[PDB]
Design a protein around this ligand. Structure first.
Ligand SMILES: Nc1ncnc2c1ncn2[C@@H]1O[C@H](COP(=O)(O)OP(=O)(O)OC[C@H]2O[C@H](OP(=O)(O)O)[C@H](O)[C@@H]2O)[C@@H](O)[C@H]1O
Length: 178
């Protein structure tokens, strides 16, 4: 089992297109794990995949993308579906980070950080994690430093993703150090 490719398939089902797998996510993103497995088994590549394989995929991952609880599974962040995933509001640390591509910096300066295709702006707890986010689009990514606690004190909402991935509503440029 190629766990990296399996994770990409699971991400598509749990973040982007659950309907394509015949799945319906609840308000917090959960779906029955046997329903996900049944849907994965529609694809020739994944007919061997067991629940055990999903736990191992999670255990071996660089990132805490998914969690399995009481026979249900969800993605913790990254969703793009029309129905807003309900996340817990959370006061952020003083500073969070956002790694991006050079070609987006002018637009972020003018408009702030926007959720774009996702439901939430995604932020990083540390510099190295943020640079890895930016490296997905740019070999020379730009580190943005977000005055997150200041933004929160002025009404910008932040939400729990995981220990390394923070979520937010749109963040005005005034809170972003370039
Ligand atoms: N006003 C504006 N004008 C122009 N561009 C703007 C803009 N505001 C923001 N942008 C940029 O628009 C891109 C959005 O791109 P994305 O939706 O992929 O967000 P992201 O890059 O944060 O990545 C999410 C997670 O996906 C991966 O997680 P996984 O590995 O899949 O688990 C990562 O690790 C993350 O945690 C980003 O470049 C923004 O900088």
């Amino acid at each position: 089992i190629d766990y990296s490719k399996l994770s990409k398939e699971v991400a598509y089902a749990l973040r982007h297109a659950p309907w394509e797998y015949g799945l319906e996510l609840d308000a917090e993103g959960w779906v029955d794990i046997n329903q996900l497995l049944s849907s994965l088994h529609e694809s020739e590549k994944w007919k061997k995949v067991s629940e055990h394989d999903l736990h191992v995929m999670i255990e071996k991952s660089d990132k805490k993308r998914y969690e399995i609880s009481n026979g249900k599974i969800r993605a913790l962040y990254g969703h793009s579906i029309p129905q807003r995933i309900i996340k817990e509001q959370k006061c952020p640390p003083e500073v969070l980070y956002h790694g991006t591509a050079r070609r987006f910096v002018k637009s972020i300066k003018e408009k702030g950080l926007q959720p774009q295709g996702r439901q939430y702006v995604h932020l990083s707890a540390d510099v190295e994690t943020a640079l890895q986010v930016g490296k997905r689009r740019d070999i020379k990514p730009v580190l943005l430093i977000v005055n997150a606690l200041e933004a929160w004190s002025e009404g910008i909402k932040f939400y729990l993703g995981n220990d390394k991935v923070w979520l937010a509503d749109a963040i005005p440029s005034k809170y972003i150090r370039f």
